[model samples]
Target chain A: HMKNVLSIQSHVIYGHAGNSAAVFPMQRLGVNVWPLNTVQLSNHMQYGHWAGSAIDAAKMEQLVDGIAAIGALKRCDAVLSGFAGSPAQARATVEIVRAVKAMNPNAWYFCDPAMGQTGGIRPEPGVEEFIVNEMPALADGMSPNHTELQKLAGRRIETVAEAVDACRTLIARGPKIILVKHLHDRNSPADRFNMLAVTETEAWIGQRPLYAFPRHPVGVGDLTSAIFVARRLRGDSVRAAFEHTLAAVHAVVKATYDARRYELELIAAQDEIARPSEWFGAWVTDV
Target chain B: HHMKNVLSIQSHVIYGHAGNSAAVFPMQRLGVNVWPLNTVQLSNHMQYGHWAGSAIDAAKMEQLVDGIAAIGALKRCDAVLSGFAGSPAQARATVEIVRAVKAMNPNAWYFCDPAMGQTGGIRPEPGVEEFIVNEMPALADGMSPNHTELQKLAGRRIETVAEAVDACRTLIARGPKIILVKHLHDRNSPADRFNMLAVTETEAWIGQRPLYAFPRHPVGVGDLTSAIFVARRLRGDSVRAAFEHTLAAVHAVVKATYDARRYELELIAAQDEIARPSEWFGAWVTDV
Candidate 1:
């Protein structure tokens, strides 16, 4: 049986698009994603709207307990999470992974560190206090854009070099593995979507295709995190895992352009996710 | 008909959606009612590549411009500013709107700030230069062209301010009544950089001490120019008044580049130019 991926995130808005964009493709690639929606809204948060529904830690505890009670917990080999709107939701996302790990120590946890993307790092009043003081420390792996990495490290993550430094700083705070996503340096001559994967003694950087357009759409990072954890659960090397992510995402972007609609067009690229590629190499990084 | 408003037609990426979002705030803050139409959707401007993309069809652009004009502001518009046409069709569509605006209200000013740079050195978007050179001048009441852009439009190798003014006059003869040579320069001294302007009978130059040997050359400088052109015209400032407004906005922009840890200009932090009008910077025509 294929390994199951459970997603604990926001539902119909910002959280939903990127996560679903990633999930829809991943399912077609042969991974099963079980979504645990903490909040559901009519549209994405880009409209500056939020109801901030939070799943209580107890609710997450119940879900894990229910999964355990029904033996579904054993079937879940990876947990992917993004955009926890409340302290409870933030804490519950952590607990969900912890509970799954307790019963199945081999399960992988991939965190998108979606504190905020481009909208700047702000979540209601108490929310930041929760995300900052808590959360993030529990994941097995994390995919943080430069800004969110800065928030985690208590400083600004601006350039590619600063991003590397930020990743090292992030790894020091736990999570054992830090994957830096969207390290955008407009000045770089290359299409600079490079990922940082860190272990205690070694760290690897995964590079992906870069396009010359401004904004692609939401959910790219979500798709990457889902694929990474899925492959890691299946025992693919970090390099191989990132290669799978790149091929899938690049195909989706090309498909998105061909489709002529934002967000709606990516669903067709879902099948492209499972397409194989032999592009994987070790990128030695300063640990 | 009495002029009342200005609409700047252009195309820009949806990336830095906040940057475009912020444009309405300043224009409205100054009480110049403005409306926006997105030309393309990208993750952000020019930083380029990591996401999906699409363009709003040219036909849609024509419909929007006509619809807005039908609302009665087109005739009332004192100026119609344009920038960054991403596609050939978009460029052509803007030309149609420019013609429509001018035909309905001949006195309504049209400033065409052509969005062409390295793309033209290599001619990436084919037939765009011809459209800009032939169609844009005929439609525009005024034009803001950068040094390279002026060269491309004039189809001549310009060497000095006098030569550039002569080139601007040549373009003026083509159609536009006013010419603002943006980022003008010759092989001579690229120091303390500046810009120049010319009307049929009058010409002017303004230079500011370069704030930094290196400045963050952000993508939306043309949009900033269009905003100043409208703001100055509305403020009842003379041509110099328009020039000074742009100078202040750009001085503030350069100051932003100096402080930015990254190379990108931070217009958000540079809000003092509009928020505190007294501190506004100025540049003058030494040879006016």
Candidate 2:
């Protein structure tokens, strides 16, 4: 039986970002992703301009209910969400997660608290507070980046140790695990990038040599969160999931850089995603 | 480099597969990078007793296409596949995007699945059928229509592969050098078999597959065939090979569903078979 994930995010029509980035990778890994797009934009805002609209709370509620009514949620193994652009959307996400777990108590919810992006820009007003205040308790696990981790915990994390403490803090409140996907911060090595996965009793830190790109690619975090969650659902431990996720992502970004493209080369590196040519083959630490 | 980047404009649903819900994943599984631009957002296929959500306007669709052009990827787009346009305006916007895409990349192809379900030689959708025949033929490089749709578009009936090719050639004369009668519910094929016909300006082909007993076949297999055919053509399949490949792949999906005794296509569960079907059908080459 195939695992199902209800992925709620934005989808770009022209390029890869949001669901466009995340869905294909997860699907490539053999997950049947039912993508409930929060916003259907022409492309991510990294382009400075986009076209399309966001789904309102009512539509979100209606669509989720529609799926549930059809009994899709019973087969759904997990719900993965990103960038709740409004208070109602966030609440709707919460409600949908509850409904999925209600149908299948074993269902997991991985929250990618898409709060801040390039240079401190965040989602709409009250979304951050709502995520910080409400998501930890509701989410089974969260895939927040370093900045989003800080925002969620209301404390700056300058090192991997600080990040784990913050993640453990959130875990105490509720979420079983917290994945700091983009761990390059003020105290991190400039030549290397890091990722930290923290559970109540354990933490693993992974490091890899960062690749040089003309500019940062869009939706890296979305893809990371999706791959990490998919591996876990497929029976990988947090440490294993972290390593495999990094390897697949490394292959994709490296493929893009070598091809001299700015966007993700997910399709190009598909084989690597399914089975990476290289393993995390990375320096790791456990706590 | 990506093999094919298909800009698929179809309706999407949160529940069952229909429109993009039916087509996108299979195309992607075949390694086609689909730029899924949904025309309508709904909770399920309207065929269901209950559905929720709404459709986007022509203006919004045009804006999305303009965004593609702004990024300078219009030239990178391989083809534009359109289905289930919700309105005459949405249908017109599909044409505009086709025109713009082909203009930016002359080699880019446009395939119109023309979701005009016919009711005895006429379209059920009000003014949209007029747009399909009058405005679309000249812009589209190819079209995939059901037997009823082919008859509706050609204003004639067909009962054999020869007659079907003749009907398809009539539409070819107008434009769209390629016409695919994806479903040929003809009098000639055995009742136990399903048939399809495809015609290019110079060549014609017909292929058939054994039909499986389904409690009910999933809706929107036409969308599935359109995506499968376009993906094959993108990799440079001839008219006959594309027909054979599409028939084989679609048969696997429906077969996979029937084996599980399910109404929905096992798109994900049987994806490998979709990319490379466990079986292959052959298309008989014929004169147009």
Candidate 3:
């Protein structure tokens, strides 16, 4: 009975992103969540100034061992992660995967590739390097936006067709399934979000109507990834998971828009997850 | 679909029964398969105070992510995490993780911590700091900074705890809901310092007496916080929900360092959040 779900990522003294947000819904949904901090900070990076330290990989391994010592390793079902502080943690996540496979091959390894971006613009250094080399290969599925798609494929995509091409290019890397989310076509706010799933030969593209709002929230990708991973873990298929993810994200975004705040309107999407209906919109791409 | 997944290839544990160690088992227990990219060390960094940093690189990381994704591992990924990078190239190794996750999930989470420097010290190489601050966050939506680091990142002095918190809030507004403000201190009172936290809509603090400062200081407080923050979130705790766990966990870990004269958290005993005696952190509706 896979009960305890462990997530390894960065820990912060303050801002509740990464592991902070990950643990909430998982626990709220009744999964045993254990978070690993990659770095400890006074607040999220938005603060512009704070204090803290990063956890070396050597200790990350030991912490994992400690958990196993308590006999929880047997029941460990899934490992989800985001925001790593160092390469050691990336290595640690890999080790964790092997151990979990040894204990429970059925245990899913869902990862939120934290290399965040939308259409154009890079956040920091080493991101392209980290994601291309370290994460995609290790994950069963992947979620990338159009901007990220361009960088991942090392090309520019201006249309949905181009974005789909990018997704296909990315699929070549290893993910049996590629959820190319937030496919931004500058011309189509009416048809903004599109997710491409390449698990099967027939690629599925999910399209969502764009909101008129100009501003967006941070943690939406994290929230989306968490929902997708959890739903997949709970036995949703690629199509079902994509639809559910879209609906949930739509609801949350709508709520955020309605309230005009950054807070996730997940409360509005609760019912949607339990009973997913074609609330917003989506389309499956064959090519 | 804008998420990145990392196939972190390191083992959290190598040996068994090393006198109550917390190495490399929790993540496995949590469900990530151990890639076993052995650093060839022992008992975490808390013990022995030294270890080898040998591991695979981007070529290796890309190979792993590519192989795993080729076999269908990339479907469930959203981000990548690279920690404790030893060499400049190893630090560069994590760059591959970012790209891999991006390849599959464009908007993947890319988190990078330079991992150079310590409390009351600096352990980075010549160009490490330069890269850590300037080029690091470019790949990272978020970056961790301590009180001293706040000054470094902001290029200003953090004279008080309030200033420190303000600084952190400022950073969050920039990007990265993940903020680990390390070691906040002030001359006014309480020689002991504490860690402060913040996220999109939440904030918290965890403080404890420096237990590992003696013979063998607990070498992984930051590791615990980073790990716990992730764990607490996974366990369904809200931003502040894990406050008790963070505080109690650290204290208990400190206690173990005191008890066995070693470094490790006594989970059960640490469940109480001894150091924080308070939970006053919030998104500050009142401030508005």
Against the true structure, what is each candidate's TM-score?
0.48, 0.95, 0.47
lDDT of 3: 0.52
Instruction: Give the interface RMSD of each candidate.
Output: 19.0, 1.5, 15.4
Off by over 4 Å in 2: A118-125, A185-188, A281-287, B1-3, B117-125
Give me the chain B TM-score of candidate 2: 0.95
Which sections of candidate 1 miss by over 4 Å?
Answer: A1-287, B1-4, B17-26, B47-51, B69-75, B120-125, B190-200, B211-216, B275-288
Candidate 3 per-residue C-alpha lDDT over A117-142 given as tens digits, one digit per residue, 9 for 90 to 100: 33344434454567666666677667
- Over B204-249, each residue of candidate 2 has an lDDT whose tens digit, in order, gives 8878888887766677788899989998888777788888889999
Q: What is the lDDT of candidate 2?
A: 0.82
**lDDT, candidate 3, at A95:** 87
lDDT for each of the candidates? Answer: 0.60, 0.82, 0.52
Q: Among all windows of ten consecutive residues in candidate 1 chain A, which has the lowest summed lDDT?
A: A46-55
Per DockQ, the best of the predicted structures is 2
Displacement of the residue B91 alpha carbon in candidate 3, Å: 38
Best candidate, lDDT-wise? 2
Model with the higher lDDT, candidate 1 or 3: 1
RMSD of 1: 21.1
